Coordinates of C-alpha atoms (C1' of nucleotides) and ligand atoms in Angstrom, one line a residue:
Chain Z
X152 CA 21.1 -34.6 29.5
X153 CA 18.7 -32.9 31.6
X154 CA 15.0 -33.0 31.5
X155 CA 12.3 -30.4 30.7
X156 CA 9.0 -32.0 28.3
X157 CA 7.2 -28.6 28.1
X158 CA 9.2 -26.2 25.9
X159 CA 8.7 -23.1 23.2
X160 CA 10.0 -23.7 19.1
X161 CA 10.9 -20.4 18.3
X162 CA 11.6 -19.4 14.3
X163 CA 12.9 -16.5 12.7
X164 CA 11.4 -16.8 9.2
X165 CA 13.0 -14.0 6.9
X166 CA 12.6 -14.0 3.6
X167 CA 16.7 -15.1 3.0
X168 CA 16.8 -17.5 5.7
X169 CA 15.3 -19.8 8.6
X170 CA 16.8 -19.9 11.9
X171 CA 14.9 -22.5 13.9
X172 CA 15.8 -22.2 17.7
X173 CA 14.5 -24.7 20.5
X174 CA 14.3 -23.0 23.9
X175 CA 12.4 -23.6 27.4
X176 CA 9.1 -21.9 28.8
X177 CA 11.1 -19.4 30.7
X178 CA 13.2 -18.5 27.2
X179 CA 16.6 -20.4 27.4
X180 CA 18.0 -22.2 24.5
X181 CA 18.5 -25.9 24.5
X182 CA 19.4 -26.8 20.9
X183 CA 19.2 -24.6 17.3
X184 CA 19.6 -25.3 13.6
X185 CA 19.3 -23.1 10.3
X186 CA 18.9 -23.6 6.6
X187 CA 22.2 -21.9 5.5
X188 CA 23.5 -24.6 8.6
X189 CA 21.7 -27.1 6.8
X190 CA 24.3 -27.3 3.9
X191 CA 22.2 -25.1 1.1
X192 CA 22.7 -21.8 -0.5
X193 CA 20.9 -19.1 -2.3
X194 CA 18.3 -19.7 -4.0
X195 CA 17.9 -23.4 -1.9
X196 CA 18.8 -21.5 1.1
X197 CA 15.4 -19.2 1.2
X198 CA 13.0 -22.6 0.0
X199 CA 10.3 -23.8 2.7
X200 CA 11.9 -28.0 1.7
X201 CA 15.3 -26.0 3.6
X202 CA 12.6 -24.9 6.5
X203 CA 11.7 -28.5 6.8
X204 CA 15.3 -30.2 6.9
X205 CA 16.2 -27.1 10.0
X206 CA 13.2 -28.3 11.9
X207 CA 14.4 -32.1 11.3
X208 CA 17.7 -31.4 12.1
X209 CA 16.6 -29.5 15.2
X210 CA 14.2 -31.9 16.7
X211 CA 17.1 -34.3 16.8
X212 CA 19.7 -32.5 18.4
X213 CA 17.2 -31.4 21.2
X214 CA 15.6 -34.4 22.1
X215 CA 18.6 -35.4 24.3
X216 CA 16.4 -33.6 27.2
X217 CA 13.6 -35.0 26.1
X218 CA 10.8 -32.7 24.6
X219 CA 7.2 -33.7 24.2
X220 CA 4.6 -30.6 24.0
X221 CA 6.0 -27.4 22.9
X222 CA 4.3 -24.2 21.9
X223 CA 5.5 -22.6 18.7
X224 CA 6.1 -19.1 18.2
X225 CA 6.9 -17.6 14.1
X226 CA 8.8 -14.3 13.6
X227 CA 9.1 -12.9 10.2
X228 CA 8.1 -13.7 6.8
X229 CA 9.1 -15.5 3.5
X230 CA 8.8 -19.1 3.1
X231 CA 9.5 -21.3 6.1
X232 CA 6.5 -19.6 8.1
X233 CA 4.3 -23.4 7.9
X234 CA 7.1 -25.9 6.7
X235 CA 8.4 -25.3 9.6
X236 CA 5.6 -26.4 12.0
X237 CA 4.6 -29.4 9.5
X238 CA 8.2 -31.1 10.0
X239 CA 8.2 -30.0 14.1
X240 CA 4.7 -32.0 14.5
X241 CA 5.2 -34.6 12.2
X242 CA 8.4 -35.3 14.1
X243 CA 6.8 -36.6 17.2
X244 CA 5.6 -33.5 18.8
X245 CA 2.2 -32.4 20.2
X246 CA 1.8 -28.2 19.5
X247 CA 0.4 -26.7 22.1
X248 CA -0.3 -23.3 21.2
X249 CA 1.1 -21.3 17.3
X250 CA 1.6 -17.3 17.8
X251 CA 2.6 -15.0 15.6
X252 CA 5.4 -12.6 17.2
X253 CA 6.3 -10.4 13.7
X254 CA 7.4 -7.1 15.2
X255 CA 5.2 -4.5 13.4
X256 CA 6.0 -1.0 14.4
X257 CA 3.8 1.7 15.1
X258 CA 5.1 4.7 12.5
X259 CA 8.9 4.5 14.1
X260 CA 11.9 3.7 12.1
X261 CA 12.7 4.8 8.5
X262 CA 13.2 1.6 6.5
X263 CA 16.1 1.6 3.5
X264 CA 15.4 3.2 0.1
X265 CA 13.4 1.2 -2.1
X266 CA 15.4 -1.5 -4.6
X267 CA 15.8 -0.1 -8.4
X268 CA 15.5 -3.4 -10.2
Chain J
X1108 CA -3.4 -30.3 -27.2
X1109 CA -4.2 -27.1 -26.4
X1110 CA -8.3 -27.0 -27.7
X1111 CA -8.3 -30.7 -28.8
X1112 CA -9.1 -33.0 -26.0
X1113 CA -8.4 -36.2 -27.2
X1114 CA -9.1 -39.9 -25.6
X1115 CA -6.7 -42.4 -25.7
X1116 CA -6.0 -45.9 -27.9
X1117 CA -7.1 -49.1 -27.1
X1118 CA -4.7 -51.4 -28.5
X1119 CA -5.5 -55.1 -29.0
X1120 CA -5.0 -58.1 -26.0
X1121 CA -2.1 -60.0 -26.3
X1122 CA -1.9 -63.3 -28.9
X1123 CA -1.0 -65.7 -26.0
X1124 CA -2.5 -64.7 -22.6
X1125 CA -5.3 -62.1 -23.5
X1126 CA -4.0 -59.1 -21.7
X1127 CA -3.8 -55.6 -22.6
X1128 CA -1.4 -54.5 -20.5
X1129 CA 1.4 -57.2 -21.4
X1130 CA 0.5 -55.3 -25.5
X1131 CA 1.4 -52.3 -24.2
X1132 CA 5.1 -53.8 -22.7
X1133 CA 5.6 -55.6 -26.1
X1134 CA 4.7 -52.1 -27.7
X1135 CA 7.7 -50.8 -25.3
X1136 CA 10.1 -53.2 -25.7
X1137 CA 9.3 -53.0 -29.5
X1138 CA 12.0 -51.0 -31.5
X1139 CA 12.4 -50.6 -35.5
X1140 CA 8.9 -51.2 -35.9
X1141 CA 9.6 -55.2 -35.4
X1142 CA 7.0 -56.7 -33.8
X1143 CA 7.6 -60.5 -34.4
X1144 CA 11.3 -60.2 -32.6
X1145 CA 9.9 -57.9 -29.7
X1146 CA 6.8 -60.4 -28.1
X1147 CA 9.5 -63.3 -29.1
X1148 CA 12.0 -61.8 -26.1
X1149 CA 9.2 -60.5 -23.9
X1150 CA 7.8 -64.4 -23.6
X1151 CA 11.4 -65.5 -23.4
X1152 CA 12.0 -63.6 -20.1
X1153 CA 8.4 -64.8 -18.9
X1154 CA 9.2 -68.5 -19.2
X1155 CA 12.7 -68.0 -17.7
X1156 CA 11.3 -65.7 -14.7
X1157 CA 8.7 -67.7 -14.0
X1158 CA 10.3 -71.2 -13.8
X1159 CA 13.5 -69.6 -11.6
X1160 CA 10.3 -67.8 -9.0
X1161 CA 7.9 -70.2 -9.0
X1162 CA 5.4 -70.6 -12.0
X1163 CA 2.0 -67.8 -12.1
X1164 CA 3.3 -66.1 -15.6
X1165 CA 0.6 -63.6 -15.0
X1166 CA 1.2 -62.7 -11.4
X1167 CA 5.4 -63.1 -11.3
X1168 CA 4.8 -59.5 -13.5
X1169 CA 2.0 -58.3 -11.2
X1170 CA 4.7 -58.3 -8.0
X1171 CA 7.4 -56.9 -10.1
X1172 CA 5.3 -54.1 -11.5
X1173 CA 3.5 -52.8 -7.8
X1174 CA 7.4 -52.1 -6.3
X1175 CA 8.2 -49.8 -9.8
X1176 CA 5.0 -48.4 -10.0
X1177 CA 5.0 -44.8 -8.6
X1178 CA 1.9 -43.1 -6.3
X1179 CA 3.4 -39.4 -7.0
X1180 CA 5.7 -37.2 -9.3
X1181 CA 7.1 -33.8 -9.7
X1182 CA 5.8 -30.9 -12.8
X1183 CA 8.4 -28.2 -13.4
X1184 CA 6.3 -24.9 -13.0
X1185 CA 7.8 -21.3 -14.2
X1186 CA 5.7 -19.0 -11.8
X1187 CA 7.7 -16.1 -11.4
X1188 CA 10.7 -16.7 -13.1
X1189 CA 11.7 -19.6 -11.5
X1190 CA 11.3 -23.4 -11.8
X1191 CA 9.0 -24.4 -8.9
X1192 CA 8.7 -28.6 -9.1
X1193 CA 4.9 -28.9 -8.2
X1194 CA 3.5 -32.5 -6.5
X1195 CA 0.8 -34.3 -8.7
X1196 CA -0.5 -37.6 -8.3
X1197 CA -0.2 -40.2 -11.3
X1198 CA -3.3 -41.9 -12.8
X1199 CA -4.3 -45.3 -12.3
X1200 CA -3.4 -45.8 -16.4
X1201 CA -0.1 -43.7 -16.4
X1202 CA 0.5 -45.6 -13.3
X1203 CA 2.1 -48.4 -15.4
X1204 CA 2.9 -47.1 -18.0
X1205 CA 5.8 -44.9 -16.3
X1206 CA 6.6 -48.5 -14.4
X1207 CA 6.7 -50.8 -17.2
X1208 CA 9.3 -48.3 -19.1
X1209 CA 11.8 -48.4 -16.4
X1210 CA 11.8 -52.3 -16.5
X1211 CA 12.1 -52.2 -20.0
X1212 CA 14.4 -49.1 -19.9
X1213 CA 16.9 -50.5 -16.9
X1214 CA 17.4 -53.8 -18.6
X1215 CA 18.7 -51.9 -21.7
X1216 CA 21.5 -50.5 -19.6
X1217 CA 22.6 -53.8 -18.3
X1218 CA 25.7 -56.0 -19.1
X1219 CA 24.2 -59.7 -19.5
X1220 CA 24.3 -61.7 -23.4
X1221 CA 21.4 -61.7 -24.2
X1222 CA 17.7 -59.0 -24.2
X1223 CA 15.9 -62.5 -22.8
X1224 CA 18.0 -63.0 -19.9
X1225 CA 18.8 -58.8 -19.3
X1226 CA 14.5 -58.8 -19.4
X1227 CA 14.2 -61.9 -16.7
X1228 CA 16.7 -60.5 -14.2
X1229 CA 15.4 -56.7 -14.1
X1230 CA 11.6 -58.9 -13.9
X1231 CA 13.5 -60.6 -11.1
X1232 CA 15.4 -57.4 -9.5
X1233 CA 11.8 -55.8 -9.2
X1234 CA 10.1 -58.7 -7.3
X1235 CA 12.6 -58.3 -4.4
X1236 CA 12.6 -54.3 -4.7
X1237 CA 16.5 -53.9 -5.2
X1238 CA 17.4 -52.8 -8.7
X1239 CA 17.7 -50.0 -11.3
X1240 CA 13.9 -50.1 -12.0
X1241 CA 12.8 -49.6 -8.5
X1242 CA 15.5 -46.6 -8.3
X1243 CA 13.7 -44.7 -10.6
X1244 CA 10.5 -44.8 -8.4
X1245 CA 12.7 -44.2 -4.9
X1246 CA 14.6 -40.5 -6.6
X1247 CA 11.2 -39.9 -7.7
X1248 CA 9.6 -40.4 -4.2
X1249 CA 12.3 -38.1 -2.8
X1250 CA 11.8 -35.2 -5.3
X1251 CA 7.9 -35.3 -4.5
X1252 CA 8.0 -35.5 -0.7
X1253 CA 10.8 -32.4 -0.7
X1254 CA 8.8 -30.3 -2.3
X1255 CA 5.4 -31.5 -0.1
X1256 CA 5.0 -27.4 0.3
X1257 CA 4.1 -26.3 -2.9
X1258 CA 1.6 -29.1 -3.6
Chain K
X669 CA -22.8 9.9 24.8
X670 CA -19.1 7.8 24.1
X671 CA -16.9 7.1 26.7
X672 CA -13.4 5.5 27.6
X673 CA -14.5 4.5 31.0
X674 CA -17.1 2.3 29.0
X675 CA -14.7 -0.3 29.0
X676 CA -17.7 -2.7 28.0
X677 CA -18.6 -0.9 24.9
X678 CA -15.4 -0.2 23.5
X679 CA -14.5 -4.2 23.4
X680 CA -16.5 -4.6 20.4
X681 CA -15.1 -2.2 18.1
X682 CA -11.9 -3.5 18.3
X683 CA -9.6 -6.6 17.2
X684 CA -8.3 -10.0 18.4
X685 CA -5.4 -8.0 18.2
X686 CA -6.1 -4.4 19.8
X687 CA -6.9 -2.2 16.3
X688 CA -9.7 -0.1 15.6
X689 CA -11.9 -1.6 13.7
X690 CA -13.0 0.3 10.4
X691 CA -15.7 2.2 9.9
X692 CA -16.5 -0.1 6.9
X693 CA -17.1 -3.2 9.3
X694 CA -18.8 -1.4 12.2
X695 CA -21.1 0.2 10.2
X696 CA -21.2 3.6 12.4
X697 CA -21.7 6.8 11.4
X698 CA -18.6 9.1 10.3
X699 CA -19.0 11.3 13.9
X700 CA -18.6 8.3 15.8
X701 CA -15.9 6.3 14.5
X702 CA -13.9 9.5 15.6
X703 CA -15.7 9.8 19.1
X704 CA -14.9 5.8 19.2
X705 CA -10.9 5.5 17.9
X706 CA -10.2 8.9 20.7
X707 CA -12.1 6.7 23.4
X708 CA -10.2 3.7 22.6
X709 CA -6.8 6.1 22.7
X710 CA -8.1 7.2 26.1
X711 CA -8.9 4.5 27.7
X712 CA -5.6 2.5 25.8
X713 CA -3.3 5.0 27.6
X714 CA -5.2 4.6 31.2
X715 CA -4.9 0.6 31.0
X716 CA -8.0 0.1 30.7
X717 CA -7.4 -1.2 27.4
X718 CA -4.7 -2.8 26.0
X719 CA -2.3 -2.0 22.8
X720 CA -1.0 -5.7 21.6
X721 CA -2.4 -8.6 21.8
X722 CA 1.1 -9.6 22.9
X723 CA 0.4 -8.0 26.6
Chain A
X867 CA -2.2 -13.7 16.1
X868 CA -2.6 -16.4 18.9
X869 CA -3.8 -19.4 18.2
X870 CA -4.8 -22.2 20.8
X871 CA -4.9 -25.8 20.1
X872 CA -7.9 -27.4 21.3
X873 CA -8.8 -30.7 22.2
X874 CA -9.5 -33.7 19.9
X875 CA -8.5 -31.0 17.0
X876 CA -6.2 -31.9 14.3
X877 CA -3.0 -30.5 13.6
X878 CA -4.2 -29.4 10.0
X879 CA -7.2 -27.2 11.1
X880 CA -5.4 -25.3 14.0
X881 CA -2.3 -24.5 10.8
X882 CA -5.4 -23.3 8.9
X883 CA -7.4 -21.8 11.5
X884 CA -3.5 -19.9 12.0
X885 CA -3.3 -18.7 8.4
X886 CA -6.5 -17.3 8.3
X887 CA -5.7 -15.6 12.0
X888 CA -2.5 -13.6 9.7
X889 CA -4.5 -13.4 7.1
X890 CA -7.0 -11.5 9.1
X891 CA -5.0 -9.5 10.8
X892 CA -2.4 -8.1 8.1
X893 CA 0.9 -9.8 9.0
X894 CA 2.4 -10.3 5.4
X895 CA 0.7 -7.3 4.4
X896 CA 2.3 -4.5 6.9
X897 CA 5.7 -6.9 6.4
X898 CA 5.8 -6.3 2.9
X899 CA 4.7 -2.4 2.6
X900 CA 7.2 -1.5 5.5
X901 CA 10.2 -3.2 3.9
X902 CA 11.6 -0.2 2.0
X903 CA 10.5 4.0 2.4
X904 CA 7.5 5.3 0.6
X905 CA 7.5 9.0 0.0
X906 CA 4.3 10.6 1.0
X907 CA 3.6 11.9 -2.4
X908 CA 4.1 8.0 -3.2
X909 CA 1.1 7.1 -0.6
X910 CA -1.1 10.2 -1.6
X911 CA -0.7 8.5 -5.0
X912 CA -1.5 5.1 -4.3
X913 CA -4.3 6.3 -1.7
X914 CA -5.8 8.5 -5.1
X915 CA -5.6 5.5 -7.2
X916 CA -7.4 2.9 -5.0
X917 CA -10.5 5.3 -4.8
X918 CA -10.3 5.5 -8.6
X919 CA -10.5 1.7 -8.7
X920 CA -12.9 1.6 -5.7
X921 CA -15.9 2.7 -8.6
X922 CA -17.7 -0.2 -10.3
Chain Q
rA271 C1' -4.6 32.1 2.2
rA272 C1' -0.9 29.2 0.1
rG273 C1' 3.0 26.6 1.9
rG274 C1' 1.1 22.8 4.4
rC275 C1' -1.0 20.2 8.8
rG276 C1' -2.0 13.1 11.8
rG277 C1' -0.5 9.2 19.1
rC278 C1' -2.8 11.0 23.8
rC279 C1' -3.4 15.1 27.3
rC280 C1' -3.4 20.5 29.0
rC281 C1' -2.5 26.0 28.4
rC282 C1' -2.6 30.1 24.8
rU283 C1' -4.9 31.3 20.0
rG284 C1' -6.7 32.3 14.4
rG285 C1' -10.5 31.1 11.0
rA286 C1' -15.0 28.7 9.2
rC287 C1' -20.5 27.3 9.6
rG288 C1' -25.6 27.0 11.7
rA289 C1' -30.2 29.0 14.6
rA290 C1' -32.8 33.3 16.5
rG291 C1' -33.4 38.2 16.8
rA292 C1' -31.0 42.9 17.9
rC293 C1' -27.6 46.7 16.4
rU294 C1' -24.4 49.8 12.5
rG295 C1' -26.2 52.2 7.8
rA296 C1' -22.9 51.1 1.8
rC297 C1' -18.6 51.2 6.2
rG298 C1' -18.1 47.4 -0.3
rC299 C1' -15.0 44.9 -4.6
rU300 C1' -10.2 45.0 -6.4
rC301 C1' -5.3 46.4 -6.0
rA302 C1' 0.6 48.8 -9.5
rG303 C1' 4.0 50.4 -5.5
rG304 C1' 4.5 48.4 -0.4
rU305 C1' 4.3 44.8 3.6
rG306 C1' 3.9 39.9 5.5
rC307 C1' 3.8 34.4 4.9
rG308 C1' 6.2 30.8 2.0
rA309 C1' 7.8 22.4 0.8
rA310 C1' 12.6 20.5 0.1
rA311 C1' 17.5 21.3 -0.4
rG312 C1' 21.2 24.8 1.1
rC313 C1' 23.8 28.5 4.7
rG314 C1' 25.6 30.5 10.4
rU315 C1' 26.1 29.6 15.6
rG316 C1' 25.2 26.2 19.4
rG317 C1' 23.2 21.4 20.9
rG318 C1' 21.2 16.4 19.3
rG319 C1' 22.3 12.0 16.4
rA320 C1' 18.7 5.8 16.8
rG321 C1' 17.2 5.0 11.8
rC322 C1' 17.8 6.8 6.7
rA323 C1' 21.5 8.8 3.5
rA324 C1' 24.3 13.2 -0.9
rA325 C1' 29.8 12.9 -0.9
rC326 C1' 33.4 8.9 0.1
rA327 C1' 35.5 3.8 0.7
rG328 C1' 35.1 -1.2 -0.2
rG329 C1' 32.5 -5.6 -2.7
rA330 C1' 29.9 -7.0 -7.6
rU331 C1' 27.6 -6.5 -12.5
rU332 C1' 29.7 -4.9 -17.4
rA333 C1' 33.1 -4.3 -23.3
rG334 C1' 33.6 -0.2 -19.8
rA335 C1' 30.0 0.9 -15.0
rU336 C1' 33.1 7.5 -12.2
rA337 C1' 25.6 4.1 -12.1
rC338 C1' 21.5 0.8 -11.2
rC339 C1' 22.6 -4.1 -6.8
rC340 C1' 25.4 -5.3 -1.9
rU341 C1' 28.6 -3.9 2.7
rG342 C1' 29.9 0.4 5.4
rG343 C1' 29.2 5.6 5.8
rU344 C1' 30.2 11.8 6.5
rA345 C1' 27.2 16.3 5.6
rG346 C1' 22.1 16.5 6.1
rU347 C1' 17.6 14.8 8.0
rC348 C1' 16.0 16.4 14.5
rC349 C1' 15.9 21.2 18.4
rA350 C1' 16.8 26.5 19.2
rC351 C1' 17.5 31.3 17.2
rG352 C1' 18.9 33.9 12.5
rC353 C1' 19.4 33.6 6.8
rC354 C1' 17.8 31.9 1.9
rG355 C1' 12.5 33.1 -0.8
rU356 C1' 12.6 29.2 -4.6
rA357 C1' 9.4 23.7 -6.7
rA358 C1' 5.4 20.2 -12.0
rA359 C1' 4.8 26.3 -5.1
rC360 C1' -0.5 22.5 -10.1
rG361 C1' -7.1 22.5 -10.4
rA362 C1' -0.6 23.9 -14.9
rU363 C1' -7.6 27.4 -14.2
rG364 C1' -6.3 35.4 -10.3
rU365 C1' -10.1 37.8 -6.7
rC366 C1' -15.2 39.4 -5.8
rG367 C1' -20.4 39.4 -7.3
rA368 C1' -25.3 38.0 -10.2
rC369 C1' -27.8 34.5 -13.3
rU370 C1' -28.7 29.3 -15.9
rU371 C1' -32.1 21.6 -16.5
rG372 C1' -30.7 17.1 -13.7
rG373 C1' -28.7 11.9 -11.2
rA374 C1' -26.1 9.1 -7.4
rG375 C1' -23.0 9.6 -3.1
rG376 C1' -19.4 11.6 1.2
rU377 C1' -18.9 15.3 5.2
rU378 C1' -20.9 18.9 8.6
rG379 C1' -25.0 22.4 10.9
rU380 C1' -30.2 23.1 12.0
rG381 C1' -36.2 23.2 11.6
rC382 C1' -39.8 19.3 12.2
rC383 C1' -42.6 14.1 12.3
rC384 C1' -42.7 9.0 14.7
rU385 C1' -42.8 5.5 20.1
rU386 C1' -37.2 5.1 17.8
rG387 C1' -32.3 -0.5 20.2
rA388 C1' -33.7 3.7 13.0
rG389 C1' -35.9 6.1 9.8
rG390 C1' -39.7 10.1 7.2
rC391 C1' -40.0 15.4 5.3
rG392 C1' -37.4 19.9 4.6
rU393 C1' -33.6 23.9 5.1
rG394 C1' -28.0 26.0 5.1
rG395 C1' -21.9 25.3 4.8
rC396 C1' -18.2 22.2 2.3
rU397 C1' -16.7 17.7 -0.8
rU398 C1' -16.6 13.4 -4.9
rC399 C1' -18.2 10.9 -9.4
rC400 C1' -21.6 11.2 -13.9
rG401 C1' -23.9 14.4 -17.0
rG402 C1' -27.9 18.7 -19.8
rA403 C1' -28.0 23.3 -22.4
rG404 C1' -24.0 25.8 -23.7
rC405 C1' -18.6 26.4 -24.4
rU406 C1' -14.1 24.1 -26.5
rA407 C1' -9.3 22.9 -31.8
rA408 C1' -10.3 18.5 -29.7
rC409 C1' -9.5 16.1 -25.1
rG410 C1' -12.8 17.7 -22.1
rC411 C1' -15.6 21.5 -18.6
rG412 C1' -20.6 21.5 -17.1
rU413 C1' -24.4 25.9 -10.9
rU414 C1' -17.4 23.9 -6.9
rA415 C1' -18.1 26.2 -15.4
rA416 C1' -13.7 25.9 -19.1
rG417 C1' -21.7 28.4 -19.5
rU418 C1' -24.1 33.5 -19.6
rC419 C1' -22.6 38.6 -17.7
rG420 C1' -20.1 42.6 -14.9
rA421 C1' -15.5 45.1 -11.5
rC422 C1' -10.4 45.3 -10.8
rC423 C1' -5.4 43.2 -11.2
rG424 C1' -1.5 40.0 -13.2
rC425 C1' 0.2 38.2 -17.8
rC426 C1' 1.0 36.6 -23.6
rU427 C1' 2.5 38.1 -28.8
rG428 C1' 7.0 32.3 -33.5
rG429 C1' 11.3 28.5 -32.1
rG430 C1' 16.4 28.3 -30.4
rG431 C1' 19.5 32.4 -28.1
rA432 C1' 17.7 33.2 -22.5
Ligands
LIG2112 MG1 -31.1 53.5 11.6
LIG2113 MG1 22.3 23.2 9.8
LIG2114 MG1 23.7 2.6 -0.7
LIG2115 MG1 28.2 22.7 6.2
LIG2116 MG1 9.1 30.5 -10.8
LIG2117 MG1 -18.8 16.2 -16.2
LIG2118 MG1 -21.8 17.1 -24.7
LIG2119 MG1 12.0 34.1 -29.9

RNA sequence: AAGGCGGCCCCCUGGACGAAGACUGACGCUCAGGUGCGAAAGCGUGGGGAGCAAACAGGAUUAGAUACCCUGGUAGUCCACGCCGUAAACGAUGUCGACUUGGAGGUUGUGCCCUUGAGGCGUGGCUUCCGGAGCUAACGCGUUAAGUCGACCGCCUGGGGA
C-alpha cells in the first residue's frame, strides 16, 4: 500500500519457535510470519527448514510496501538464528547491517529449576 | 566395509554398440539371472524410441538420462537421538546409476502390454521431463534443498 | 598510576561489546587487572564509558 | 554483536564474520548456562573441576 | 575464628602482613565450668513481594504415578527487630610451639642491581600441584605432615537398639 524501502527484519529465535517480524526503521510493524503459523509442529516446528519457510512467507506478505534494504536484528537462540537471514537475502533483499539483540542480564532474575530428565 | 576399502567392477561393453554404461542398464533390467531375454527388451525399446524421436540410438538415451539424473541427495544421520537428513552430493558414477534405475524401476509400474513398449515410453517420458522417472529426481531435489541447513 | 579519567587507556582492555577483558588476554599483572576492572566501573558509571554495545 | 555490511562484500562472509562476532563474544554460551538455576555449591563445583582439568 | 563474604561510592570499624628502630620485661600456651558467634529451613510482630517455589489445583506419562515433565501457584525466599542453635557446620584432620632433602607455579610485602615502554639477585606473609626420607592397613600424607618431639583440651571402646 504505502511505501517505505529502508526497513529492520526483526526475529525472535527461541529454541521452540521462530517468530519472524518485519517492521520500519523507527520500529513499527508492517507484516509478520512464524513457524508454528507456517503449518508445522513439534519437533518440525523448532527446525531451521521451518525458519526458512517464516522468512519466505514473510518477505511476501510485506513486499506490498515495497522493501529493498533492510537491516536485520536476531533475538534468542536455537535453530533459526542463520536460516533465517539466508531465505531473507536470497529473497531479493540487500542486508544492510546483522545485530545481535539477545537480552543477557547482569546477575538479575532467578531462572526456573533445572529439568530432571 | 568397515576396514576393507574396496574398488568397484568393470563389467564388459555392450555386444552391439560398445558401451559400458548401456551393460550396466541391461544388468538392471536383468531379472532371474536371464541375460539373453533382458538386452533382447532393452534393444526393443531402443529401436522403437529411436524411430518415434528421431534416429541417434546412442544420444535419444543420453537426453533421457540428464533430466533423471540427480546433482544431490539426502543421508539420514542419528546425532543426538534424532534423524537429521544431511545434504551430500552424488558422484559422477553413482550419478547414473541412481538414474538409470528409476527408468528401469518406473516402467515396471506402468500399465502398457508389453516390457518393450513400457521401456520406450518411460525412455520417451524422460526426454520431455514429465514422468514417474523424473519424479523421483524432483521429491529428491525438494528433500535436499529443505534441509540446505545442515549441509 | 591507573585512572578512570584515562578514558584513552582504558579503551583497550575492553570489548567490542563493553566487558573487561581477562587477565589471560591482557597479559597484566594480578594488581592491575583489579586497579583496571574498578577504573572501568568508575569511569562506566560517570559516562565516560559505556556498558552495552547496544548504547 | 554488530555487524556492518561493507561494500563489494558478499553475503556469505558478513554471516560468517557474524558467527564468529557471537562466537567471540559468548551469546549461546551465557544463553544456555542462564536457562535454568545453578546452586552455588553447583558453580563452586564446576569452578573446582575446570582447574583440575586445566593441568596438562 | 567458623559460619561465611562479590556492582559502584561515602561514613564508622575489626583483623592480617612488611620495613626500621625504640619501649615493656615471661606479661606465655591451653582450657572442664562459663560466655559470645553460628548456612539453610523453621517460628513471632510489622512491612515488602518482580522472579523462583514447599503445600495445593489443573494438564500428561504410567499397569498404577499421591513423583520425575508441563500450566498455574500459597507459605517462604527480601527488610526491621526478637527467637531457634542445628548441616556431609568437612581438610570428615583440636589449639600452640620446636625440628627434618627437593621441583614447578599463584598471590601479597620489602632490600638491592640495570638505563627499564621489563627483567637480574635476595629476603618475609599466605596459597596450589608433584614429590624425598619417614609414616600409613592400604588409599594416600609429605616443612600448610597423616614425619620427628613436647603442652593442654575434646573424644572412642563390636553391630542393630539409639
Ligand atoms: Mg629494662
Ligand atoms: Mg517470617
Ligand atoms: Mg513445578
Ligand atoms: Mg507461618
Ligand atoms: Mg551434630
Ligand atoms: Mg604429595
Ligand atoms: Mg613413597
Ligand atoms: Mg552396641
Amino acid at each position: 500500500r504505502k511505501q517505505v524501502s529502508d526497513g529492520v527484519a526483526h526475529i525472535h529465535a527461541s529454541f521452540n519457535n521462530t517468530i519472524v517480524t518485519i517492521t520500519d526503521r523507527q520500529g513499527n510493524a508492517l507484516g509478520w510470519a512464524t513457524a508454528g503459523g507456517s503449518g508445522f509442529r513439534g519437533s518440525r516446528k523448532s527446525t531451521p527448514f521451518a525458519a526458512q519457510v517464516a522468512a519466505e512467507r514473510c518477505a511476501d506478505a510485506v513486499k506490498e510496501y515495497g522493501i529493498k534494504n533492510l537491516e536485520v536484528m536476531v533475538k534468542g537462540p536455537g535453530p533459526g538464528r542463520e536460516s533465517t537471514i539466508r531465505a531473507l537475502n536470497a529473497a531479493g533483499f540487500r542486508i544492510t547491517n546483522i545485530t545481535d539483540v539477545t537480552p543477557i542480564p547482569h546477575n538479575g532474575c532467578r531462572p526456573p529449576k533445572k529439568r530432571r530428565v | 566395509p568397515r576396514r576393507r576399502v574396496i574398488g568397484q567392477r568393470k563389467i564388459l561393453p555392450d555386444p552391439k554398440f560398445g558401451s559400458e554404461l548401456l551393460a550396466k542398464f541391461v544388468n538392471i533390467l536383468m531379472v532371474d539371472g536371464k541375460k539373453s531375454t533382458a538386452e533382447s527388451i532393452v534393444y526393443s525399446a531402443l529401436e522403437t524410441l529411436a524411430q518415434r524421436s528421431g534416429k541417434s540410438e546412442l544420444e535419444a538415451f543420453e537426453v533421457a538420462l540428464e533430466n533423471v539424473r540427480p546433482t544431490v541427495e539426502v543421508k539420514s544421520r542419528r546425532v543426538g537421538g534424532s534423524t537429521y537428513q544431511v545434504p551430500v552430493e552424488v558422484r559422477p558414477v553413482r550419478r547414473n546409476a541412481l538414474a538409470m534405475r528409476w527408468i528401469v524401476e518406473a516402467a515396471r509400474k506402468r500399465g502398457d502390454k508389453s516390457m518393450a513398449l513400457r521401456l520406450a515410453n518411460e525412455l520417451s517420458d524422460a526426454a520431455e521431463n514429465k514422468g514417474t522417472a523424473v519424479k523421483k529426481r524432483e521429491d529428491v531435489h525438494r528433500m535436499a534443498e529443505a534441509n540446505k541447513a545442515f549441509a | 598510576e591507573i585512572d578512570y579519567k584515562d578514558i584513552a587507556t582504558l579503551k583497550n582492555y575492553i570489548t567490542e561489546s563493553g566487558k573487561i577483558v581477562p587477565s589471560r588476554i591482557t597479559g597484566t599483572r594480578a594488581k592491575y587487572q583489579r586497579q583496571l576492572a574498578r577504573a572501568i566501573k568508575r569511569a562506566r558509571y560517570l559516562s565516560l564509558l559505556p556498558y552495552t554495545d547496544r548504547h | 554483536p554488530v555487524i556492518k555490511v561493507r561494500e563489494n562484500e558478499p553475503f556469505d562472509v558478513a554471516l560468517r564474520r557474524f558467527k564468529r562476532s557471537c562466537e567471540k563474544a559468548g551469546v549461546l554460551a551465557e544463553v544456555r548456562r542462564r536457562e535454568f538455576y545453578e546452586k552455588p555449591t553447583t558453580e563452586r563445583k564446576r569452578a573446582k573441576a575446570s582447574a583440575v582439568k586445566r593441568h596438562a
